[PDB]
Ligand binder design. Structure first.
Ligand code: F41
Length: 330
């Protein structure tokens, strides 16, 4: 089997991407944030504290003839950005882009943190990291991808995120029309439960490539590109007036600037992030100070190849017995 679904930016900055997901019988369609940095499929629901729901579409398990309470199971997740959610668990039928999994754990939120409430466009998350990170207790549950894997034509999914435009998540096949040149594959460590890999270096603008190992995660659920302070300083040094602002929480730059590109290495291959992709717009409405899309990972504990990086590529998440990642230009 295969599936194919369009993923759409939530706003004009590509702060996140939402993908429609059918849950239950009859289907209830929720727009979920596909997150290769976590492993829980959770949704706003009829059980979510009412004051914590503000415009989201909810899953109502009592209206699904295929929903079953997973007795005794609870979940609770805290994302690295400080957001969180928790609740209980149903199994139900879940379909993405025509690919159906029966008996998928659907984690129903009883509580969500303010950042989730305040984002009316995201109805929940669909985790695509390794199932070892799943938070369901006392019996850990599998991700949608792990459940689907054995049925797929090939045990892969691909992320093709758009810049200020829709893109695609495919399951079970590699669309050879969706990228240019060849896909370069690179090793993955699953030791921390992530799609963790080592970039071979970087360049800023038209500058020389610096060969250096940068260990990080391919994370569709993180907006920005978080890299070591040395790398990030080298980038922003090429932008007149750019500075790190402790009050704002990162590098800012004059909105009048033209940003240089940023290149990262994948083996001997190179992915170029255009300068425009690194502009996250005014820090507050009307400001002439703009927020940078490349930020330091110091204090995070890991480098994160978030959407800023991934959207410049066609990305293969190869879930074969020994997982790998593939990157192609597009
Ligand atoms: O928390 C995030 C992104 N966040 C995920 C949940 C939905 C809203 C966006 N990413 C992140 C990814 C890895 C990290 C980390 C943070 O801090 C430590 O490691």
């Amino acid at each position: 089997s295969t599936g194919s679904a369009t993923t759409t930016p939530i706003d004009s900055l590509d702060d996140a991407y939402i993908t429609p997901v059918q849950i239950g019988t009859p289907a209830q369609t929720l727009n979920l944030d596909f997150d290769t940095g976590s492993s829980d499929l959770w949704v706003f629901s009829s059980e979510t504290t009412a004051s914590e729901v503000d415009g989201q579409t909810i899953y109502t398990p009592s209206k699904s003839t295929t929903a079953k309470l997973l007795s005794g199971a609870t979940w609770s997740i805290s994302y690295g950005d400080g957001s969180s959610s928790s609740g209980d668990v149903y199994t139900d039928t879940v379909s993405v882009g025509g690919l159906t999994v029966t008996g998928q754990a659907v984690e129903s939120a009883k509580k969500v943190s303010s950042s989730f409430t305040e984002d009316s466009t995201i109805d929940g998350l669909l985790g695509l990291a390794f199932s070892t990170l799943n938070t369901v207790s006392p019996t850990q549950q599998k991700t949608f991808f792990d459940n689907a894997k054995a049925s797929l034509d090939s045990p892969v999914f691909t992320a093709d995120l758009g810049y200020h435009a829709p893109g695609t998540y495919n399951f079970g096949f590699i669309d050879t029309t969706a990228y240019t040149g060849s896909i370069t594959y690179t090793a993955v460590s699953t030791k921390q439960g992530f799609w963790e890999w080592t970039s071979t270096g970087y360049a800023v603008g038209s500058g020389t490539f610096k060969s250096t190992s940068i260990d990080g995660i391919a994370d569709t659920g993180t907006t920005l590109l978080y890299l070591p302070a040395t790398v990030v300083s080298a980038y922003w040094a090429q932008v007149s007036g750019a500075k790190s602002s402790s009050s704002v929480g990162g590098y800012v730059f004059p909105c009048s600037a033209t940003l240089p590109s940023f290149t990262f290495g994948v083996g001997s291959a190179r992915i170029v992030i255009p300068g425009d992709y690194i502009d996250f717009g005014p820090i507050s409405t009307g400001s002439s100070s703009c927020f940078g899309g490349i930020q330091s990972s110091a204090g995070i504990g890991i480098n994160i190849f978030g959407d800023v990086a991934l959207k410049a590529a066609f990305v293969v998440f190869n879930g074969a017995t020994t997982p790998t990642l593939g990157f192609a230009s597009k």
